[PDB]
Structure formats: C-alpha cells, structure tokens
C-alpha cells in the first residue's frame, strides 16, 4: 500500500488490475526488468 | 554497530571526496586549454599585420584602370596568407569587399603576383614582397584624376591596415603613376 | 545483509566521457565510455 499525502488529498492507494488511464485512487505496476510484473524476485528486478 | 556503521559511511565519504576532487581538476583542465588558446590567438591578432610599401597603377587613355599594391610582412609577424585575407574597397562609386580570385586578368576580387619570395600567396619570410592586384574597371568604373580610394587590408587574424590611394591631380602624358 | 549493503555503496559506475555521431544537422547516436568506480567488483552491463 502507498500513502499519498498530497497537496489536496490524503489517502492510501491499493493495487489495481492492469488499468492505466482509469486508475482512480489505485496504483498499477508495469515491469521494467524481470519476468514478473508485480513481484520483485531478485536484486536485478526493477518495477515502475 | 557503531563499528559497522562507521566503516560503511567512511567508504561513502572517500567516494564523495573523489567526486569533489574530480570536478575541480577536470574543470581546470578545460580552462587550461581555453586559456592557452586565447593567449595565442590574441597575441597573433596584435602582431600579425600587413604593411603596404607602395602603390602604382596603369594609365590608359586618361584613366587609371589598375591599382597595384606592394605589401610586406609587419614587424615580428608570422606567416601571412593572402588568400584568407580580405581587402575593403571604399571607392568613389562602389563600396564592396574584395576577396582572392585564383588566377584572373578579376571582377570584384583581387589577385597576387609575388614580387619576391618562394610563394605567391604567403608572406613566409621578412624580406618577401607580394603584389596585390586590383582591377579598377572591374570593381567599379575606371578611376579618374582625383578620385581617391580607401583600402583596408584585413588579415585573417583581424589586424587591419588602412591605405588611402589618391590618383594624381593631372593624368596628362604619363603611362604609370604612383597612387 | 552486510555483504549486499557494502556492494550497493561501493560497486558504482564512473562515466569517463560522452560523444555522438552527427549527420546532416542532428546527433543520431549518444555513446558513453564507462569505468568501474574505486574499489568496485565485477559490474555486468546487462543487468544494468
Ligand atoms: C599593375 O599590375 C598588373 C599585373 O598584371 C599589370 O598588368 C599588365 O599590364 C600590362 C601593361 O598594360 O603594362 C599588360 O600588357 C599587355 O599584355 C601582355 C600580355 O599579353 O598579357 C603583353 O602582351 C603582348 O605584348 C606584345 C608586345 O610586342 O607588345 C604584343 O605583341 C601583344 O600585345 C602581346 O603579345 S603576346 O605576348 O604574344 O600575347 C604586353 O605586356 S608585357 O608582357 O609586359 O610586355 C602587353 O601587350 C598585361 O596584359 C597586364 O596583365 C598592370 O599594367 C599594372 O598597372
Ligand atoms: C557511437 O558509436 C557507434 C559504434 O558503432 C558508431 O556507430 C557507427 O558509426 C559509423 C559512422 O557513421 O561513424 C557507421 O559507419 C558505417 O558503417 C560501417 C560498418 O558497415 O558498420 C562501415 O561500413 C563500410 O563503409 C563503406 C564506405 O565506403 O562507406 C561501405 O563500402 C560499406 O557501407 C561498409 O563496407 S565494409 O567496411 O567493407 O563493411 C563504415 O564505417 S567505418 O567502418 O568506420 O569505415 C560506414 O559505412 C557504423 O555503421 C555505425 O555502427 C556511432 O557513429 C557513434 O556515434
């Protein structure tokens, strides 16, 4: 979970299924380095 | 622990100091090369110059239709290429800027001929004279008795030499004159 | 944890210089020359 203490709101963002441009108060993860796109396996994995 | 904590931080601090020492020396490296080049070119600007020894021209009918310049190296100058050099022509009509035309009669350009030396475009030695050739009826109209011309021979480095060419008062009974 | 933390701090890449080819009137490549930092170990440039 991610806590967004922003300039206006203050919520706790939870993960949502692959839904970009429609992600309301949720957050989505797209993989950068690795086979998995939601879990960090080894030290070399990078996830956006 | 404090023993473990100190060692990791100490490893970081030498790396930070390495980066800080890195930028300082390299920045001085660029300023070294830029500074040395500026000193050489600025010195070349003041020193490398052209001196005009004398000027003369042909006389046809009753109009000076050539202007010839005898240039020479300035005091202490280095090699003076006469192709990368330019000469301004503020005449009685036109007011253009001549350049080198490799081999000609030259329209709106000047030519060399090498009076003395081992080159016809470079003032390599100190005792070598090169003749700058300028066509009058090509850059403008054929000069008449009294029509003065202002010439500034600009070298590549930037040094300028001004010579005022004054046609004699009367052009009667003479094949050539001394402008 | 002790080994990995020291590896994180020490194993670093140093960039020596950067240059690129230029065609027509636009840089079409950006090349960098890299070297390992002080006291670093083997740095694989594929997991990077
Ligand atoms: C400034 O400096 C320029 C430098 O070029 C100088 O220019 C020359 O001026 C000469 C003269 O007016 O003083 C011009 O001379 C003539 O042309 C020459 C050549 O053809 O270019 C020569 O021509 C031959 O001369 C013979 C001779 O018996 O008179 C004639 O049969 C015929 O005209 C030509 O025959 S040829 O050689 O078989 O072609 C001659 O001059 S010379 O070489 O000095 O003897 C002149 O006719 C010269 O053309 C011109 O570039 C300016 O005068 C200076 O003010
Ligand atoms: C960053 O670093 C990269 C490193 O690759 C660099 O990329 C290269 O840039 C070269 C150039 O633009 O600077 C490119 O060069 C060309 O291709 C080469 C090769 O085929 O890859 C060479 O090819 C030969 O060129 C001859 C020539 O007459 O043109 C041709 O007959 C034919 O295309 C090739 O024949 S061959 O050599 O018998 O195979 C040549 O460059 S060379 O090897 O330096 O002489 C160029 O044609 C290169 O392809 C490219 O990867 C970037 O420029 C940097 O910014």
Strands (E), C1-48: 13-19, 22-23, 26-27, 31-36
Task: Give the whole-angstrom CA distance, residue B76 versus residue A45.
Answer: 69
Return the bridge partners of C15, or none: C34
Tokens (6 digits) for C30:
């950006």
CA distance B99 to B64: 21
Residue C37 · residue C14 · CB < 8 Å: yes
In sequence order, which ranges of chain B are alpha helices (DSSP H)? Answer: 2-47, 136-139
> C32: Cβ below 6 Å to ligand 2?
no
Q: Which residues pair with residue B60 across a beta bridge?
A: B63
With a CB-CB cutoff of 8 Å, which residues 4-43 of chain C face chain A? Answer: 4
- Experimental technique used? cryo-EM
Resolution in A: 3.2
Report how far residue C34's alpha carbon sits from residue B170's, in angstroms, rounded to the nearest whole number.
Answer: 78
Buried/exposed code over B28-65 (b: 16+ C-beta within 10 A; e: otherwise): eeeeeeeeeeeeeeeebeeebbbebeebbbebeeebbb
Assigned token pair, B35: 């500074």
Question: Rounded to an integer, what distance in angstroms lies between the CA atom of residue B153 and that of residue B126?
Answer: 18
C in contact with B (at least 3 C-beta pairs within 8 A):
yes
Most A CBs within 10 A among C41, C47, C48, hence the mutation to make, goes to C47
Chains B+A touching (3+ CB pairs under 8 Å):
no
Give B43-88 as a DSSP string: HHHHH--EEEEEEEEEEETTEE-EEEEEEEE-TT----BSSS-EEE
Q: CA separation (Å) from C16 to B11, B105, C13, C34?
A: 21, 57, 10, 6
- In ligand 2, the atom with minimum distance to the C-alpha of C21 is 55
CA distance C11 to B75: 61
Q: Quick check: B168 and B145 in contact, CB under 8 A?
A: yes
Tokens of B166: 């004054």
Q: How far is CA B145 from the centre of its chain?
A: 30
Q: What is the maximum span of chain C, computed from C-alpha positions, in angstroms?
A: 53
B chain contacts of residue C12, beta-carbon cutoff 8 Å: 15
How far apart are alpha carbons B171 and B174 in whole angstroms?
Answer: 6
d(CA C47, CA C22): 29
Round to whole Å and give the CA distance between B105 and C17: 53
CA B88 to chain centre: 11
The set of residues, in sequence order, having a beta carbon less than 8 Å from that of B112 and lying 6+ positions away, is B82, B100, B120, B121, B130, B131, B132, B133
Cβ neighbours for B87, distance < 8 A, ≥ 6 positions apart? B97, B98, B110, B132, B134, B151, B152, B153, B154
CA-nearest residue, atom 10 of ligand 2:
C21
Q: What is the CA radius of gyration of chain C?
A: 16
Q: Which residues pair with C26 in a beta bridge?
A: C23
Please name the residues between 7 and 36 in chain C that touch chain B, using a CB distance below 8 Å.
Answer: 9-10, 12
Q: What residues contact residue B62 under an 8 Å CB cut-off, 6+ apart?
A: B144, B145, B171, B172
Helices B2-47, C2-10: inter-axial angle, 10-degree rounding:
10
Cβ neighbours, 10 Å, residue B98: 22
Q: What's the DSSP call for residue B142? A: P
Both tokens of B178, joined, read 């001394």
């Amino acid at each position: 979970t991610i806590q967004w203490i922003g300039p206006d709101x203050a919520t706790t963002l939870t993960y949502x299924x692959x839904x970009x441009x429609x992600x309301x108060e949720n957050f989505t993860t797209x993989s950068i380095k690795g086979x998995x796109x939601x879990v960090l396996v080894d030290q070399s994995d990078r996830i956006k | 622990q404090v023993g473990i904590g100190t060692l990791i931080v100490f490893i970081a601090m030498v790396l930070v100091a390495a980066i800080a020492a890195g930028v300082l020396i390299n920045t001085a490296g660029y300023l070294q090369s830029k500074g040395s080049a500026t000193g050489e070119e600025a010195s070349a600007q003041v020193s490398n110059r052209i001196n005009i020894v004398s000027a003369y021209g042909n006389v046809x009918x009753x109009x000076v239709d050539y202007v010839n310049l005898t240039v020479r190296q300035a005091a202490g100058a280095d090699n003076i290429n006469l192709x990368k050099s330019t000469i301004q022509w503020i005449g009685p009509d036109x007011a253009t800027t001549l350049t080198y035309x490799x081999x000609x009669x030259x329209x709106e350009n000047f030519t060399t001929x090498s009076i003395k030396g081992x080159x016809x475009x470079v003032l390599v030695d100190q005792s070598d004279r090169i003749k700058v050739i300028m066509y009058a009826x090509x850059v403008x109209x054929x000069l008449x008795x009294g029509x003065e011309v202002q010439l500034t021979v600009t070298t590549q480095y930037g040094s300028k030499t001004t010579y005022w060419a004054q046609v004699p008062e009367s052009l009667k009974d003479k094949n050539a004159v001394x402008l």
